[PDB]
Design a protein around this ligand. Structure first.
Ligand code: A1BOU
Ligand code: ZN
Length: 139
């Protein structure tokens, strides 16, 4: 679980969005596993606007932060789950790191701010849904 809070927006994994997120929907993209909803209170986070390929992510299944080197946002095949049929997920970045299904939502940050959130994983891999291209989050 986990979310980014920036301005009057809450960014979450689309497969974990609540009834309240859908009732306050701003934008969603199943192919990116992202959903953004509106909030009344001002958020706490800053979004990176960069091309960093190193950062630190929060891993809830270890209660620990880990450093990672991650690939540029790309179209990656993701196996069928209870949430989605087998498909290509876009704007996804892969890294070597520990992750478990309940780790989705953990924030990946670089020196410039929030880069994205955990969205996929398996066998010593972790995938992050990028948010750096969503320029409208800052306005
Ligand atoms: C952090 O996720 C994992 C880590 C280790 C093992 C596994 Cl099987 C996962 N589960 C996943 O990758 N997904 C299940 C939930 C939805 C995901 C998606 N974006 O399509 C895919
Ligand atoms: Zn950066």
């Amino acid at each position: 679980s986990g979310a980014i809070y920036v301005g009057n927006y809450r960014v979450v994994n689309r497969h974990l969005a609540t009834h309240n997120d859908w009732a306050n929907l701003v934008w969603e993209d199943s192919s990116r596993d992202l959903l953004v909803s509106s909030t009344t209170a001002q958020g706490c986070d800053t979004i990176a606007r960069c091309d960093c390929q190193t950062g630190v992510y929060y891993c809830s299944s270890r209660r620990k932060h880990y450093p990672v080197s991650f690939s540029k946002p790309s179209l990656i095949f993701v196996e069928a789950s209870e949430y989605y049929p087998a498909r290509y997920q876009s704007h996804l970045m892969l890294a070597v790191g520990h992750s478990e299904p309940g780790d989705c939502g953990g924030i990946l940050r670089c020196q410039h701010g929030v880069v994205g959130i955990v969205s996929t994983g398996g066998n010593g891999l972790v995938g992050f849904a990028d948010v750096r291209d969503l320029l409208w989050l800052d306005e």
